[PDB]
Amino acid sequence: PPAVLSKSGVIYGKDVKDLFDYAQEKGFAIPAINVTSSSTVVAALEAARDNKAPIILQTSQGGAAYFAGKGVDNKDQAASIAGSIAAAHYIRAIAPTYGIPVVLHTDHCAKKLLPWFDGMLKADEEFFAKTGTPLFSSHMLDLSEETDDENIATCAKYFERMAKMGQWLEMEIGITGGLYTSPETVFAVYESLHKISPNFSIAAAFGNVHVQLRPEILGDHQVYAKKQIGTDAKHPLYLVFHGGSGSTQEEFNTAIKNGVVKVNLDTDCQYAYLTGIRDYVTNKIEYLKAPVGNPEGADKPNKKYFDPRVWVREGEKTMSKRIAEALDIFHTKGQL
Amino acid sequence: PPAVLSKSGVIYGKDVKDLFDYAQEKGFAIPAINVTSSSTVVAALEAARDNKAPIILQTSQGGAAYFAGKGVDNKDQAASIAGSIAAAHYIRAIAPTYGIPVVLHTDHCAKKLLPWFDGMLKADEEFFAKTGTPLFSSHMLDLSEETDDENIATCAKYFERMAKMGQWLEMEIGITGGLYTSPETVFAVYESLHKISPNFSIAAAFGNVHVQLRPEILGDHQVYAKKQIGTDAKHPLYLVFHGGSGSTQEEFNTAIKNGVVKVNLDTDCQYAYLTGIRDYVTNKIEYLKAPVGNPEGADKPNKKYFDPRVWVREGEKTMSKRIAEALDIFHTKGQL
Numbered sequence: 001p002p003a004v005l006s007k008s009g010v011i012y013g014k015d016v017k018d019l020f021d022y023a024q025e026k027g028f029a030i031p032a033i034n035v036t037s038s039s040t041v042v043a044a045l046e047a048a049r050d051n052k053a054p055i056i057l058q059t060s061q062g063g064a065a066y067f068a069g070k071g072v073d074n075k076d077q078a079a080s081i082a083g084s085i086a087a088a089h090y091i092r093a094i095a096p097t098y099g100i101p102v103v104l105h106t107d108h109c110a111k112k113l114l115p116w117f118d119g120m121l122k123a124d125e126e127f128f129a130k131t132g133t134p135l136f137s138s139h140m141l142d143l144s145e146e147t148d149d150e151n152i153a154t155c156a157k158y159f160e161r162m163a164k165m166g167q168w169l170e171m172e173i174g175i176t177g178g179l180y181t182s183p184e185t186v187f188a189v190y191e192s193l194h195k196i197s198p199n200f201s202i203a204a205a206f207g208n209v210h211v212q213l214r215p216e217i218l219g220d221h222q223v224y225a226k227k228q229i230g231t232d233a234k235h236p237l238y239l240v241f242h243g244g245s246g247s248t249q250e251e252f253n254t255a256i257k258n259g260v261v262k263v264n265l266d267t268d269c270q271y272a273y274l275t276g277i278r279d280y281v282t283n284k285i286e287y288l289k290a291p292v293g294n295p296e297g298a299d300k301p302n303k304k305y306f307d308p309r310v311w312v313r314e315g316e317k318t319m320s321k322r323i324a325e326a327l328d329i330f331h332t333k334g335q336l
Numbered sequence: 337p338p339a340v341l342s343k344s345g346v347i348y349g350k351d352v353k354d355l356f357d358y359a360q361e362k363g364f365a366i367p368a369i370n371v372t373s374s375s376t377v378v379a380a381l382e383a384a385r386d387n388k389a390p391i392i393l394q395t396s397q398g399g400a401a402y403f404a405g406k407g408v409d410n411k412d413q414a415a416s417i418a419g420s421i422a423a424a425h426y427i428r429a430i431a432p433t434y435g436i437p438v439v440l441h442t443d444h445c446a447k448k449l450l451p452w453f454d455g456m457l458k459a460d461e462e463f464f465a466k467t468g469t470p471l472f473s474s475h476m477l478d479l480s481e482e483t484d485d486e487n488i489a490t491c492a493k494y495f496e497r498m499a500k501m502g503q504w505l506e507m508e509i510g511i512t513g514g515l516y517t518s519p520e521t522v523f524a525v526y527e528s529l530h531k532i533s534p535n536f537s538i539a540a541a542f543g544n545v546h547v548q549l550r551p552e553i554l555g556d557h558q559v560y561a562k563k564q565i566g567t568d569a570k571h572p573l574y575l576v577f578h579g580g581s582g583s584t585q586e587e588f589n590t591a592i593k594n595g596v597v598k599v600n601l602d603t604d605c606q607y608a609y610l611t612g613i614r615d616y617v618t619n620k621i622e623y624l625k626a627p628v629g630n631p632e633g634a635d636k637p638n639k640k641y642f643d644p645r646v647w648v649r650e651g652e653k654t655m656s657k658r659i660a661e662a663l664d665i666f667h668t669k670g671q672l
């Protein structure tokens with residue numbers, strides 16, 4: 001019963017690994033929700049609190065810039081650095097109020113976006129040098145479009161600088177090298193980063209497009225690692241499921257059983273969030289200033305009907321429920 | 337040319353007074369725009385950076401609570417404290433990117449809501465002792481429902497507590513005491529607060545209901561003030577204009593002429609923020625999960641169209657251009 005299931009807010013350092021080790025010990029996985037706004041982080045935070053579950057808010061490169069604003073110049077990664085930092089401070093400031101452990105993470109960052117990674121990394125080190133924690137709980141490199149030698153080598157390079165801050169790195173490997181990811185590719189990842197810190201999770205290629213899904217390959221990844229490590233460890237790696245959408249429970253369950261701790265969502269939530277707002281097209285007529293076809297045909301105040309605290313909340317309300325479904329489907333509901 | 341005009345980020349201390357003395361000297365007022373999310377804050381920072389203007393972002397007790405999330409119980413003022421705090425950090429973190437001075441201020445706090453004020457002023461001090469600045473630039477107490485005997489006293493208590501941090505306090509006085517408000521009771525305020533510190537503005541009752549609007553009473557205050565103190569400067573009082581709605585440009589002008597520095601917006605930013613998103617009802621045939629009216633039936637992805645980053649942006653856009661119009665009316669545009 002690690003400390004993490006009792007804490008409340010963003011969590012760092014050894015509390016991340018413990019939340020993930022419990023993940024595999026009690027066989028569930030944690031949703032990784034891509035946020036873009038104060039209101040999207042609200043909906044996951046409260047979906048998570050209501051099903052008394054842990055949660056992962058994450059910031060993609062483009063999602064980061066949105067937190068800054070699509071109108072802030074982003075040629076130099078300036079917006080994704082700034083707005084990702086802004087999201088961190090905001091999430092950190094709010095999350096404790098919802099009373100659950102949150103993993104603040106940054107999503108896909110390919111080789112051409114490493115300026116953004118670099119920015120967050122300086123941000124972290126500064127924060128670490130005053131507070132004792134980095135700014136973000138976790139960070140991801142998606143260098144899977146590079147050869148695996150290169151991909152891994154600069155994972156290690158960055159990982160070395162993150163390990164001094166006890167920070168979590170997530171790593172995506174694919175099918176380059178010089179068709180799925182051989183367990184051999186995945187173990188190569190492990191023996192490079194495991195000599196730096198255990199604080200790392202791997203997202204491997206296993207038919208998760210983003211020809212079909214072979215999540216059992218993830219088990220073979222783990223068994224191969226089990227052999228070579230020489231441990232009696234059922235789950236020698238920390239695994240991540242990208243492109244979780246339309247995966248039936250059959251596919252989620254053998255993935256969790258194969259040691260996945262994190263299943264990304266994004267696109268599903270995107271639609272969940274809209275539908276509640278979209279379902280303010282029922283108020284079609286009560287939304288163009290003063291005209292109301294209901295009582296007062298052109299002399300009503302639509303203030304009550306147009307105030308964004310009434311219709312945006314219909315977005316928060318719908319997104320959370322999508323998250324609760326995955327929260328249940330992933331078996332993370334009720335885990336604290 | 338005060339240094340503050342060239343600053344960038346949330347301003348504190350006498351930089352605020354400087355902004356206001358500047359606004360009073362060059363005869364413009366700054367719009368105070370209520371925010372309720374990261375998305376809404378972006379819309380106003382963008383409007384200001386673009387029209388080369390300073391700007392005041394403010395959180396209402398309800399808007400504060402929204403920043404915490406409508407599902408955070410707010411029974412002991414708990415949501416509005418979290419939400420104003422996390423929005424304090426978010427705005428502070430993102431505002432320097434927009435490159436304009438921002439005053440972080442809070443909206444209506446009446447007697448029933450001092451818990452929210454206490455939690456916010458509690459965090460200011462704590463923060464002030466860490467960093468050298470409070471969290472928020474400014475706070476308001478609106479205690480006009482209480483006898484003006486009691487009003488002046490409760491602000492003087494808080495103002496002594498904020499003046500050590502140099503925080504700005506704005507107070508609303510009504511028409512009680514023990515029909516608009518007198519230049520006499522309005523001078524009463526100044527005569528007490530100015531002992532503590534110069535950093536206060538006055539929100540008087542002059543038919544800005546929120547029987548009609550008398551912006552000329554505000555020059556009456558400045559004329560009364562100057563005599564009883566005996567100063568030269570025509571504007572011995574910082575005046576703020578609540579509920580100035582659909583007021584003519586003549587009406588706003590005579591109030592700015594009498595030293596109004598800050599004119600509160602909100603509910604047409606509310607309506608303006610909506611319309612843009614509402615004008616994505618035009619895209620409803622491409623707004624159900626997989627069926628799309630335009631290309632190949634039932635088999636094209638509606639992802640592009642329902643990414644909240646394209647349609648919420650549209651709301652931010654129509655909200656900002658509503659702020660631009662305001663920045664023109666009040667003559668704050670292009671004053672940096």
Ligand SMILES: O=C(O)CCCC[C@@H]1CCSS1
Binds near residue numbers: 601604663665666
């Ligand atoms: O934009 C202006 O110049 C006047 C705005 C009048 C309405 C105010 C926005 C809604 S609250 S009061």
Ligand SMILES: [Zn+2]
Binds near residue numbers: 108142210
């Ligand atoms: Zn991926």
Ligand SMILES: [Zn+2]
Binds near residue numbers: 444478578
């Ligand atoms: Zn008022």
